[PDB]
């Protein structure tokens, strides 16, 4: 029930980096942590990922299934809709601030680093 629009629908992806636990709660060999994308580097890896996804109508879905939040890997497509629920200060303000085109300016939060995309 509502008179105008409010809730925010949207899609997104997730890269791998240091984060705040291990790598991304994915199916990997616990073996031993190795040197790879890290906090800073993460933003750098996305800096070009957003750029690449920015220029060149490359793909995204299948990518959103592999390089995406474990659950998102299953839903590499998009979230769907969520006004003041789900997401939080960063992402939400991202889909609420952008609108297809810039593809969000590096979304590092929640799990690690993501990149939103609605219409396009």
mmCIF file of N, CA, C and O in Angstrom, residues 15-96:
data_model
loop_
_atom_site.group_PDB
_atom_site.id
_atom_site.type_symbol
_atom_site.label_atom_id
_atom_site.label_comp_id
_atom_site.label_asym_id
_atom_site.label_seq_id
_atom_site.Cartn_x
_atom_site.Cartn_y
_atom_site.Cartn_z
ATOM 1 N N UNK A 15 33.201 -9.109 -5.050
ATOM 2 C CA UNK A 15 34.565 -9.609 -5.389
ATOM 3 C C UNK A 15 35.198 -10.252 -4.144
ATOM 4 O O UNK A 15 34.633 -10.229 -3.069
ATOM 5 N N UNK A 16 36.364 -10.823 -4.281
ATOM 6 C CA UNK A 16 37.020 -11.458 -3.101
ATOM 7 C C UNK A 16 38.120 -10.546 -2.547
ATOM 8 O O UNK A 16 38.840 -9.904 -3.286
ATOM 9 N N UNK A 17 38.254 -10.488 -1.249
ATOM 10 C CA UNK A 17 39.305 -9.624 -0.637
ATOM 11 C C UNK A 17 39.496 -9.991 0.837
ATOM 12 O O UNK A 17 39.021 -11.010 1.299
ATOM 13 N N UNK A 18 40.189 -9.172 1.578
ATOM 14 C CA UNK A 18 40.414 -9.478 3.021
ATOM 15 C C UNK A 18 39.077 -9.590 3.758
ATOM 16 O O UNK A 18 38.775 -10.595 4.370
ATOM 17 N N UNK A 19 38.280 -8.563 3.705
ATOM 18 C CA UNK A 19 36.963 -8.601 4.402
ATOM 19 C C UNK A 19 37.179 -8.498 5.914
ATOM 20 O O UNK A 19 38.027 -7.764 6.382
ATOM 21 N N UNK A 20 36.418 -9.228 6.683
ATOM 22 C CA UNK A 20 36.581 -9.171 8.165
ATOM 23 C C UNK A 20 36.509 -10.581 8.761
ATOM 24 O O UNK A 20 36.282 -10.755 9.942
ATOM 25 N N UNK A 21 36.705 -11.587 7.953
ATOM 26 C CA UNK A 21 36.649 -12.984 8.475
ATOM 27 C C UNK A 21 37.672 -13.861 7.748
ATOM 28 O O UNK A 21 38.733 -14.151 8.262
ATOM 29 N N UNK A 22 37.360 -14.286 6.554
ATOM 30 C CA UNK A 22 38.315 -15.147 5.792
ATOM 31 C C UNK A 22 38.438 -14.649 4.350
ATOM 32 O O UNK A 22 39.362 -13.939 4.006
ATOM 33 N N UNK A 23 37.513 -15.010 3.505
ATOM 34 C CA UNK A 23 37.578 -14.552 2.088
ATOM 35 C C UNK A 23 36.178 -14.192 1.587
ATOM 36 O O UNK A 23 35.971 -13.155 0.989
ATOM 37 N N UNK A 24 35.213 -15.037 1.829
ATOM 38 C CA UNK A 24 33.827 -14.735 1.368
ATOM 39 C C UNK A 24 32.893 -15.909 1.682
ATOM 40 O O UNK A 24 31.954 -16.174 0.958
ATOM 41 N N UNK A 25 33.145 -16.611 2.752
ATOM 42 C CA UNK A 25 32.272 -17.766 3.112
ATOM 43 C C UNK A 25 31.918 -18.575 1.862
ATOM 44 O O UNK A 25 30.775 -18.923 1.639
ATOM 45 N N UNK A 26 32.889 -18.876 1.043
ATOM 46 C CA UNK A 26 32.608 -19.662 -0.191
ATOM 47 C C UNK A 26 33.112 -21.099 -0.028
ATOM 48 O O UNK A 26 33.574 -21.489 1.026
ATOM 49 N N UNK A 27 33.029 -21.889 -1.063
ATOM 50 C CA UNK A 27 33.507 -23.298 -0.962
ATOM 51 C C UNK A 27 34.985 -23.386 -1.353
ATOM 52 O O UNK A 27 35.327 -23.812 -2.439
ATOM 53 N N UNK A 28 35.862 -22.986 -0.474
ATOM 54 C CA UNK A 28 37.318 -23.047 -0.789
ATOM 55 C C UNK A 28 38.032 -23.966 0.205
ATOM 56 O O UNK A 28 37.504 -24.275 1.255
ATOM 57 N N UNK A 29 39.215 -24.372 -0.163
ATOM 58 C CA UNK A 29 40.016 -25.263 0.709
ATOM 59 C C UNK A 29 40.588 -24.471 1.885
ATOM 60 O O UNK A 29 41.484 -23.667 1.720
ATOM 61 N N UNK A 30 40.079 -24.683 3.072
ATOM 62 C CA UNK A 30 40.608 -23.931 4.245
ATOM 63 C C UNK A 30 42.138 -23.885 4.179
ATOM 64 O O UNK A 30 42.741 -22.877 4.485
ATOM 65 N N UNK A 31 42.747 -24.972 3.755
ATOM 66 C CA UNK A 31 44.242 -25.050 3.622
ATOM 67 C C UNK A 31 44.933 -23.951 4.430
ATOM 68 O O UNK A 31 45.060 -24.034 5.634
ATOM 69 N N UNK A 32 45.379 -22.917 3.770
ATOM 70 C CA UNK A 32 46.062 -21.805 4.488
ATOM 71 C C UNK A 32 45.863 -20.489 3.733
ATOM 72 O O UNK A 32 46.071 -20.411 2.538
ATOM 73 N N UNK A 33 45.462 -19.454 4.419
ATOM 74 C CA UNK A 33 45.249 -18.143 3.740
ATOM 75 C C UNK A 33 46.505 -17.737 2.965
ATOM 76 O O UNK A 33 47.615 -17.904 3.429
ATOM 77 N N UNK A 34 46.336 -17.200 1.787
ATOM 78 C CA UNK A 34 47.517 -16.778 0.981
ATOM 79 C C UNK A 34 47.429 -15.283 0.662
ATOM 80 O O UNK A 34 46.428 -14.643 0.914
ATOM 81 N N UNK A 35 48.470 -14.721 0.112
ATOM 82 C CA UNK A 35 48.443 -13.268 -0.219
ATOM 83 C C UNK A 35 47.610 -13.025 -1.479
ATOM 84 O O UNK A 35 47.870 -13.584 -2.527
ATOM 85 N N UNK A 36 46.609 -12.196 -1.384
ATOM 86 C CA UNK A 36 45.755 -11.913 -2.574
ATOM 87 C C UNK A 36 45.084 -10.547 -2.415
ATOM 88 O O UNK A 36 45.553 -9.698 -1.684
ATOM 89 N N UNK A 37 43.987 -10.326 -3.086
ATOM 90 C CA UNK A 37 43.294 -9.014 -2.960
ATOM 91 C C UNK A 37 43.070 -8.687 -1.481
ATOM 92 O O UNK A 37 42.680 -9.533 -0.702
ATOM 93 N N UNK A 38 43.320 -7.469 -1.087
ATOM 94 C CA UNK A 38 43.124 -7.093 0.344
ATOM 95 C C UNK A 38 42.248 -5.842 0.448
ATOM 96 O O UNK A 38 41.781 -5.323 -0.544
ATOM 97 N N UNK A 39 42.026 -5.356 1.643
ATOM 98 C CA UNK A 39 41.180 -4.136 1.811
ATOM 99 C C UNK A 39 41.489 -3.126 0.706
ATOM 100 O O UNK A 39 40.756 -2.996 -0.254
ATOM 101 N N UNK A 40 42.572 -2.417 0.827
ATOM 102 C CA UNK A 40 42.932 -1.425 -0.223
ATOM 103 C C UNK A 40 42.846 -2.076 -1.605
ATOM 104 O O UNK A 40 42.009 -1.733 -2.414
ATOM 105 N N UNK A 41 43.711 -3.013 -1.877
ATOM 106 C CA UNK A 41 43.690 -3.691 -3.207
ATOM 107 C C UNK A 41 42.250 -3.961 -3.650
ATOM 108 O O UNK A 41 41.898 -3.770 -4.797
ATOM 109 N N UNK A 42 41.416 -4.401 -2.751
ATOM 110 C CA UNK A 42 39.999 -4.680 -3.125
ATOM 111 C C UNK A 42 39.421 -3.489 -3.888
ATOM 112 O O UNK A 42 38.926 -3.623 -4.990
ATOM 113 N N UNK A 43 39.491 -2.323 -3.314
ATOM 114 C CA UNK A 43 38.956 -1.121 -4.012
ATOM 115 C C UNK A 43 39.655 -0.970 -5.366
ATOM 116 O O UNK A 43 39.061 -0.563 -6.346
ATOM 117 N N UNK A 44 40.912 -1.308 -5.424
ATOM 118 C CA UNK A 44 41.656 -1.204 -6.709
ATOM 119 C C UNK A 44 41.110 -2.234 -7.693
ATOM 120 O O UNK A 44 40.867 -1.943 -8.848
ATOM 121 N N UNK A 45 40.902 -3.437 -7.236
ATOM 122 C CA UNK A 45 40.355 -4.490 -8.135
ATOM 123 C C UNK A 45 38.984 -4.055 -8.647
ATOM 124 O O UNK A 45 38.632 -4.282 -9.788
ATOM 125 N N UNK A 46 38.214 -3.416 -7.812
ATOM 126 C CA UNK A 46 36.869 -2.946 -8.247
ATOM 127 C C UNK A 46 37.021 -1.689 -9.104
ATOM 128 O O UNK A 46 36.301 -1.485 -10.062
ATOM 129 N N UNK A 47 37.963 -0.849 -8.771
ATOM 130 C CA UNK A 47 38.171 0.391 -9.571
ATOM 131 C C UNK A 47 38.200 0.040 -11.059
ATOM 132 O O UNK A 47 37.623 0.723 -11.883
ATOM 133 N N UNK A 48 38.859 -1.030 -11.404
ATOM 134 C CA UNK A 48 38.923 -1.447 -12.834
ATOM 135 C C UNK A 48 37.698 -2.295 -13.182
ATOM 136 O O UNK A 48 37.213 -2.275 -14.295
ATOM 137 N N UNK A 49 37.184 -3.031 -12.234
ATOM 138 C CA UNK A 49 35.982 -3.864 -12.518
ATOM 139 C C UNK A 49 34.810 -2.938 -12.859
ATOM 140 O O UNK A 49 34.102 -3.141 -13.826
ATOM 141 N N UNK A 50 34.628 -1.904 -12.088
ATOM 142 C CA UNK A 50 33.534 -0.939 -12.387
ATOM 143 C C UNK A 50 33.850 -0.265 -13.719
ATOM 144 O O UNK A 50 32.989 -0.049 -14.549
ATOM 145 N N UNK A 51 35.100 0.043 -13.928
ATOM 146 C CA UNK A 51 35.527 0.677 -15.205
ATOM 147 C C UNK A 51 35.240 -0.285 -16.349
ATOM 148 O O UNK A 51 34.562 0.034 -17.306
ATOM 149 N N UNK A 52 35.749 -1.469 -16.246
ATOM 150 C CA UNK A 52 35.496 -2.470 -17.315
ATOM 151 C C UNK A 52 33.988 -2.643 -17.478
ATOM 152 O O UNK A 52 33.452 -2.503 -18.560
ATOM 153 N N UNK A 53 33.291 -2.916 -16.407
ATOM 154 C CA UNK A 53 31.814 -3.059 -16.509
ATOM 155 C C UNK A 53 31.232 -1.727 -16.983
ATOM 156 O O UNK A 53 30.172 -1.669 -17.574
ATOM 157 N N UNK A 54 31.941 -0.656 -16.739
ATOM 158 C CA UNK A 54 31.464 0.681 -17.185
ATOM 159 C C UNK A 54 31.571 0.771 -18.710
ATOM 160 O O UNK A 54 30.594 0.983 -19.401
ATOM 161 N N UNK A 55 32.750 0.599 -19.240
ATOM 162 C CA UNK A 55 32.915 0.663 -20.721
ATOM 163 C C UNK A 55 32.881 -0.749 -21.311
ATOM 164 O O UNK A 55 33.441 -1.676 -20.761
ATOM 165 N N UNK A 56 32.227 -0.919 -22.422
ATOM 166 C CA UNK A 56 32.153 -2.264 -23.045
ATOM 167 C C UNK A 56 30.942 -3.001 -22.489
ATOM 168 O O UNK A 56 30.907 -3.375 -21.333
ATOM 169 N N UNK A 57 29.945 -3.219 -23.298
ATOM 170 C CA UNK A 57 28.735 -3.939 -22.809
ATOM 171 C C UNK A 57 29.069 -5.408 -22.544
ATOM 172 O O UNK A 57 28.414 -6.304 -23.040
ATOM 173 N N UNK A 58 30.084 -5.663 -21.765
ATOM 174 C CA UNK A 58 30.461 -7.070 -21.468
ATOM 175 C C UNK A 58 29.280 -7.815 -20.837
ATOM 176 O O UNK A 58 28.135 -7.459 -21.032
ATOM 177 N N UNK A 59 29.548 -8.847 -20.084
ATOM 178 C CA UNK A 59 28.439 -9.610 -19.446
ATOM 179 C C UNK A 59 28.273 -9.188 -17.983
ATOM 180 O O UNK A 59 28.771 -8.162 -17.562
ATOM 181 N N UNK A 60 27.575 -9.972 -17.207
ATOM 182 C CA UNK A 60 27.375 -9.617 -15.772
ATOM 183 C C UNK A 60 26.679 -10.764 -15.038
ATOM 184 O O UNK A 60 27.150 -11.246 -14.028
ATOM 185 N N UNK A 61 25.561 -11.202 -15.541
ATOM 186 C CA UNK A 61 24.823 -12.317 -14.875
ATOM 187 C C UNK A 61 25.788 -13.442 -14.473
ATOM 188 O O UNK A 61 26.203 -13.528 -13.335
ATOM 189 N N UNK A 62 26.144 -14.304 -15.391
ATOM 190 C CA UNK A 62 27.076 -15.422 -15.053
ATOM 191 C C UNK A 62 28.181 -14.928 -14.119
ATOM 192 O O UNK A 62 28.553 -15.599 -13.177
ATOM 193 N N UNK A 63 28.698 -13.754 -14.357
ATOM 194 C CA UNK A 63 29.762 -13.225 -13.459
ATOM 195 C C UNK A 63 29.170 -12.999 -12.072
ATOM 196 O O UNK A 63 29.764 -13.317 -11.061
ATOM 197 N N UNK A 64 27.989 -12.455 -12.028
ATOM 198 C CA UNK A 64 27.319 -12.201 -10.725
ATOM 199 C C UNK A 64 27.030 -13.523 -10.021
ATOM 200 O O UNK A 64 26.669 -13.560 -8.865
ATOM 201 N N UNK A 65 27.177 -14.608 -10.719
ATOM 202 C CA UNK A 65 26.913 -15.938 -10.095
ATOM 203 C C UNK A 65 28.209 -16.509 -9.511
ATOM 204 O O UNK A 65 28.203 -17.168 -8.489
ATOM 205 N N UNK A 66 29.319 -16.263 -10.153
ATOM 206 C CA UNK A 66 30.616 -16.792 -9.639
ATOM 207 C C UNK A 66 31.264 -15.780 -8.692
ATOM 208 O O UNK A 66 31.420 -16.025 -7.512
ATOM 209 N N UNK A 67 31.638 -14.646 -9.205
ATOM 210 C CA UNK A 67 32.277 -13.607 -8.349
ATOM 211 C C UNK A 67 31.208 -12.816 -7.602
ATOM 212 O O UNK A 67 31.079 -11.620 -7.769
ATOM 213 N N UNK A 68 30.436 -13.471 -6.785
ATOM 214 C CA UNK A 68 29.372 -12.745 -6.035
ATOM 215 C C UNK A 68 29.169 -13.354 -4.650
ATOM 216 O O UNK A 68 29.623 -14.444 -4.365
ATOM 217 N N UNK A 69 28.481 -12.659 -3.786
ATOM 218 C CA UNK A 69 28.244 -13.205 -2.426
ATOM 219 C C UNK A 69 27.764 -14.644 -2.541
ATOM 220 O O UNK A 69 26.924 -14.957 -3.358
ATOM 221 N N UNK A 70 28.308 -15.520 -1.740
ATOM 222 C CA UNK A 70 27.904 -16.954 -1.793
ATOM 223 C C UNK A 70 26.416 -17.070 -2.137
ATOM 224 O O UNK A 70 26.036 -17.639 -3.145
ATOM 225 N N UNK A 71 25.575 -16.498 -1.326
ATOM 226 C CA UNK A 71 24.122 -16.537 -1.624
ATOM 227 C C UNK A 71 23.887 -15.858 -2.968
ATOM 228 O O UNK A 71 23.158 -16.341 -3.810
ATOM 229 N N UNK A 72 24.526 -14.741 -3.171
ATOM 230 C CA UNK A 72 24.375 -14.013 -4.461
ATOM 231 C C UNK A 72 24.841 -14.900 -5.612
ATOM 232 O O UNK A 72 24.241 -14.923 -6.660
ATOM 233 N N UNK A 73 25.890 -15.655 -5.432
ATOM 234 C CA UNK A 73 26.326 -16.547 -6.545
ATOM 235 C C UNK A 73 25.092 -17.296 -7.038
ATOM 236 O O UNK A 73 24.890 -17.493 -8.220
ATOM 237 N N UNK A 74 24.240 -17.670 -6.121
ATOM 238 C CA UNK A 74 22.978 -18.359 -6.502
ATOM 239 C C UNK A 74 22.029 -17.316 -7.101
ATOM 240 O O UNK A 74 21.239 -17.596 -7.980
ATOM 241 N N UNK A 75 22.134 -16.102 -6.626
ATOM 242 C CA UNK A 75 21.285 -14.986 -7.141
ATOM 243 C C UNK A 75 22.191 -13.908 -7.752
ATOM 244 O O UNK A 75 22.130 -12.751 -7.389
ATOM 245 N N UNK A 76 23.049 -14.290 -8.661
ATOM 246 C CA UNK A 76 23.981 -13.305 -9.278
ATOM 247 C C UNK A 76 23.175 -12.201 -9.940
ATOM 248 O O UNK A 76 23.666 -11.120 -10.196
ATOM 249 N N UNK A 77 21.939 -12.465 -10.216
ATOM 250 C CA UNK A 77 21.096 -11.431 -10.864
ATOM 251 C C UNK A 77 20.995 -10.207 -9.952
ATOM 252 O O UNK A 77 21.885 -9.366 -9.893
ATOM 253 N N UNK A 78 19.913 -10.091 -9.241
ATOM 254 C CA UNK A 78 19.757 -8.913 -8.353
ATOM 255 C C UNK A 78 19.020 -9.271 -7.063
ATOM 256 O O UNK A 78 18.558 -10.379 -6.876
ATOM 257 N N UNK A 79 18.891 -8.315 -6.186
ATOM 258 C CA UNK A 79 18.163 -8.555 -4.912
ATOM 259 C C UNK A 79 16.666 -8.571 -5.215
ATOM 260 O O UNK A 79 15.971 -9.537 -4.979
ATOM 261 N N UNK A 80 16.185 -7.483 -5.742
ATOM 262 C CA UNK A 80 14.749 -7.361 -6.089
ATOM 263 C C UNK A 80 14.250 -6.033 -5.558
ATOM 264 O O UNK A 80 14.277 -5.036 -6.242
ATOM 265 N N UNK A 81 13.811 -6.013 -4.335
ATOM 266 C CA UNK A 81 13.309 -4.742 -3.748
ATOM 267 C C UNK A 81 13.511 -4.714 -2.232
ATOM 268 O O UNK A 81 13.365 -5.711 -1.551
ATOM 269 N N UNK A 82 13.839 -3.569 -1.701
ATOM 270 C CA UNK A 82 14.046 -3.447 -0.230
ATOM 271 C C UNK A 82 14.216 -1.969 0.137
ATOM 272 O O UNK A 82 15.244 -1.374 -0.108
ATOM 273 N N UNK A 83 13.209 -1.365 0.704
ATOM 274 C CA UNK A 83 13.310 0.079 1.060
ATOM 275 C C UNK A 83 14.290 0.277 2.217
ATOM 276 O O UNK A 83 15.492 0.276 2.035
ATOM 277 N N UNK A 84 13.783 0.461 3.403
ATOM 278 C CA UNK A 84 14.682 0.676 4.576
ATOM 279 C C UNK A 84 15.080 -0.670 5.184
ATOM 280 O O UNK A 84 15.574 -0.740 6.291
ATOM 281 N N UNK A 85 14.868 -1.737 4.465
ATOM 282 C CA UNK A 85 15.234 -3.080 4.995
ATOM 283 C C UNK A 85 16.402 -3.644 4.185
ATOM 284 O O UNK A 85 16.767 -3.112 3.154
ATOM 285 N N UNK A 86 16.994 -4.714 4.638
ATOM 286 C CA UNK A 86 18.141 -5.303 3.883
ATOM 287 C C UNK A 86 19.218 -4.246 3.676
ATOM 288 O O UNK A 86 19.059 -3.102 4.056
ATOM 289 N N UNK A 87 20.301 -4.611 3.053
ATOM 290 C CA UNK A 87 21.370 -3.615 2.799
ATOM 291 C C UNK A 87 21.595 -2.766 4.052
ATOM 292 O O UNK A 87 21.293 -3.183 5.153
ATOM 293 N N UNK A 88 22.123 -1.582 3.904
ATOM 294 C CA UNK A 88 22.355 -0.732 5.105
ATOM 295 C C UNK A 88 22.692 0.710 4.695
ATOM 296 O O UNK A 88 22.119 1.252 3.772
ATOM 297 N N UNK A 89 23.598 1.341 5.389
ATOM 298 C CA UNK A 89 23.953 2.754 5.058
ATOM 299 C C UNK A 89 24.671 2.873 3.703
ATOM 300 O O UNK A 89 24.321 3.714 2.901
ATOM 301 N N UNK A 90 25.671 2.055 3.498
ATOM 302 C CA UNK A 90 26.451 2.117 2.233
ATOM 303 C C UNK A 90 25.621 1.681 1.016
ATOM 304 O O UNK A 90 25.126 2.508 0.275
ATOM 305 N N UNK A 91 25.491 0.403 0.774
ATOM 306 C CA UNK A 91 24.722 -0.041 -0.430
ATOM 307 C C UNK A 91 23.450 0.778 -0.620
ATOM 308 O O UNK A 91 23.287 1.456 -1.609
ATOM 309 N N UNK A 92 22.524 0.683 0.290
ATOM 310 C CA UNK A 92 21.243 1.428 0.121
ATOM 311 C C UNK A 92 21.516 2.840 -0.402
ATOM 312 O O UNK A 92 21.040 3.225 -1.450
ATOM 313 N N UNK A 93 22.290 3.608 0.308
ATOM 314 C CA UNK A 93 22.599 4.986 -0.168
ATOM 315 C C UNK A 93 23.185 4.917 -1.581
ATOM 316 O O UNK A 93 23.165 5.879 -2.324
ATOM 317 N N UNK A 94 23.691 3.774 -1.954
ATOM 318 C CA UNK A 94 24.268 3.612 -3.319
ATOM 319 C C UNK A 94 23.146 3.515 -4.349
ATOM 320 O O UNK A 94 23.069 4.291 -5.280
ATOM 321 N N UNK A 95 22.272 2.566 -4.180
ATOM 322 C CA UNK A 95 21.150 2.413 -5.142
ATOM 323 C C UNK A 95 20.211 3.610 -5.011
ATOM 324 O O UNK A 95 19.538 3.995 -5.948
ATOM 325 N N UNK A 96 20.176 4.211 -3.855
ATOM 326 C CA UNK A 96 19.300 5.396 -3.656
ATOM 327 C C UNK A 96 19.985 6.634 -4.234
ATOM 328 O O UNK A 96 19.355 7.630 -4.534
#
